[PDB]
Amino acid sequence: PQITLWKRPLVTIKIGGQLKEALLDTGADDTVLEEMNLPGRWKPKMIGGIGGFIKVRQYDQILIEICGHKAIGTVLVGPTPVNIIGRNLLTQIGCTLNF
């Protein structure tokens, strides 16, 4: 599909057997999701943006389905205000910018 940018590019994702709304974010190197209790081990990490850094939990080899397209990679979990799909997963679903 093609998504215009008049509004925030929000889509439905599936992760850990749950549906959520997330932002397709070409400005995000990594994928940052709202607080959730994913199983398995994780590594502490900090990521920075406008305003400073937040503490997040890095889970690896996590499957996410974005608009029916499957992707598996690293997902960061922490007190983010919005679910953010970053380039590490956007590349896997064949997402490009076009103008």
Ligand X SMILES: CCOP(=O)(COc1ccc(C[C@H](NC(=O)O[C@H]2CO[C@H]3OCC[C@H]32)[C@H](O)CN(C[C@@H](C)CC)S(=O)(=O)c2ccc3c(c2)OCO3)cc1)OCC
Question: Which positions lie near ligand X, rule CB under 6 A?
Answer: 23, 25, 27-30, 32, 47-50, 52, 81-82, 84, 86
Name 71's Cβ contacts closer than 8 Å, sequence gap at least 6.
63, 64, 65, 89, 92, 93
Q: What is the pairing mode between strands 32-33 and 43-49?
A: unpaired
> Which residue of the set 25, 29, 30, 60 is catalytic?
25
Classify residue 90 by its DSSP letter: H
Choose the one of its own copies, ligand X, none that binds residue 30, judging by a C-beta under 5 to 8 angstroms depending on kind.
Answer: ligand X
Note the residues at the interface with its own copies (CB under 8 A).
1-6, 8-9, 23-29, 32, 47-54, 67, 69, 80-81, 84, 87, 90-91, 93-99
